[PDB]
Amino acid sequence: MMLYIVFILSVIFVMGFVGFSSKPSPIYGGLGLIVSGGVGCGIVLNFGGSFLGLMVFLIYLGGMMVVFGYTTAMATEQYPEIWLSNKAVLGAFVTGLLMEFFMVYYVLKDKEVEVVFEFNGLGDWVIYDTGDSGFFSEEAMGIAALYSYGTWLVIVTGWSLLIGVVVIMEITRGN
């Protein structure tokens, strides 16, 4: 049912994580993180944040494109490993999906599960707000306050990105 779209996207979100957490060739690990970024954008986008969902997808699409170039230069071998070529990779991949299956199986059967925290399986739609906003997007108004309210945040992040460029040149200088 489409009422569980958020839950169905979060299952793919975990499956993508098991994709790169099992650590095959970073080429295939990068693909797994793109799938998680794509569905993660979908999950966030269904809670009312379209800018946040599209932005994280946009940032991670460029992030894994640099990682792809770095994988062909410094993280490549003759036979890049897939989720089936190695027992250690395959073992961790099957284990991740089985735990995902059991958690999904129990939450949809009992409507509850207790692991550190107590989770509810009624559906994500039961916690949404029943009132409408006005003529604006609340997420957009909060993000636009960074420049009027977040003067201190803009300075530290701005300085951090500046020093970030200085640092990477220093680290990679080699002399």
Binding site: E112, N120, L122, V126, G142, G150, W152
Partner: protein
């Protein structure tokens, strides 16, 4: 804060985002604004040792609004009971609950 430069200098560096009942753009309220305000006003100036026991009612309502644990349990029981009655043909849903 370990060093309270903000309070002495009179500069607000990060206090404006610490609570969700503070001033927001366009006076947009948070869903648990009333509950947070009550817990903050109950436990003002009395220390966390006292507030942990004397403002326990407000803080439990505030946590109920935040995570809705007790409401979802209540909905679960009603929904579970309705299925049991329907599964054994003992309850007819009304029209406005079906269409």
């Amino acid at each position: 804060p370990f060093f309270d430069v903000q309070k002495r200098l009179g500069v607000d560096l990060d206090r404006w985002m610490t609570i969700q009942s503070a001033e927001q753009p366009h006076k947009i309220p948070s869903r648990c604004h009333a509950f947070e305000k009550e817990w903050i006003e109950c436990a003002h100036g009395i220390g966390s040792i006292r507030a942990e026991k004397e403002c326990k009612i407000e803080f439990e309502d505030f946590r109920e609004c935040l995570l809705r644990q007790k409401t979802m349990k209540r909905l679960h029981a009603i929904r579970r009971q309705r299925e049991k009655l329907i599964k054994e043909g003992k309850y007819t849903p009304p029209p406005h609950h079906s269409g």
